[PDB]
Design a protein around this ligand. Sequence first.
Ligand SMILES: *[C@@H]1O[C@H](CO)[C@@H](O[C@@H]2O[C@H](CO)[C@@H](O[C@@H]3O[C@H](CO)[C@@H](O)[C@H](O)[C@@H]3O)[C@H](O)[C@H]2NC(C)=O)[C@H](O)[C@H]1NC(C)=O
Lengths: 96, 47, 59
Amino acid sequence: NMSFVKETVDKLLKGYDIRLRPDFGGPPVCVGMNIDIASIDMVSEVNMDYTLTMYFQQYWRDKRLAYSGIPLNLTLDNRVADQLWVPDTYFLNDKK
Amino acid sequence: NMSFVKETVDKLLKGYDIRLRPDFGGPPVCVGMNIDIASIDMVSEVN
Amino acid sequence: KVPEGDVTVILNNLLEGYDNKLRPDIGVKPTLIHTDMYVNSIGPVNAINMEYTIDIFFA
Ligand SMILES: *[C@@H]1O[C@H](CO)[C@@H](O[C@@H]2O[C@H](CO)[C@@H](O[C@@H]3O[C@H](CO)[C@@H](O)[C@H](O)[C@@H]3O)[C@H](O)[C@H]2NC(C)=O)[C@H](O)[C@H]1NC(C)=O
């Protein structure tokens, strides 16, 4: 069972172009976002800013990362994010 | 000679396993230590 | 004891095809991790910010 996961992951990451978004040239990729607020620390009047800790989660479909034959969802090591396209989300009113 | 030193350094660094201490199976490696104090620039009782 | 070359070949043959992306016993059973902690010191308690500092060795 292990070697099947080896082959599947290696096949998925083989020939993957991080520079191109999913469905490049096609319709826009839909990204579903949710947040879980852990705390709001310092609402400062003098600075005009609020500090906020949160778990920020994004969901998007990618045909390149589709696999079959494994009936379970794969939780990979976080560093694999360096080898994958991720949306360029950012917070506009951020100070730091 | 200059070149003698130049390839001597490369000879030294070649075949060197960083992952193992000197005398890996032998006695412990002795590490002497010196400290040259430049300055103590702060002593806070608060912290 | 044994030559340094023996430990070197053992070390470089340890990795081989490892693929650290995958956890041990993936798709078989949960990976059991035993946690150990040594509290070097519990730092100052900042009542203003509702926090406290702590220094630990975590294994
Ligand atoms: C792999 O991950 C997926 C995504 O989380 C898992 O699918 C989701 O499983 C949950 C629990 O079975 C589903 O929730 C239930 O769905 C029914 C029908 O919609 C709803 O009436 C219930 O209130 C509850 O929400 C969830 O729908 C499902 N996701 C989708 C898109 O259908 C899946 O179970 C995971 N598989 C493994 C082997 O880990």
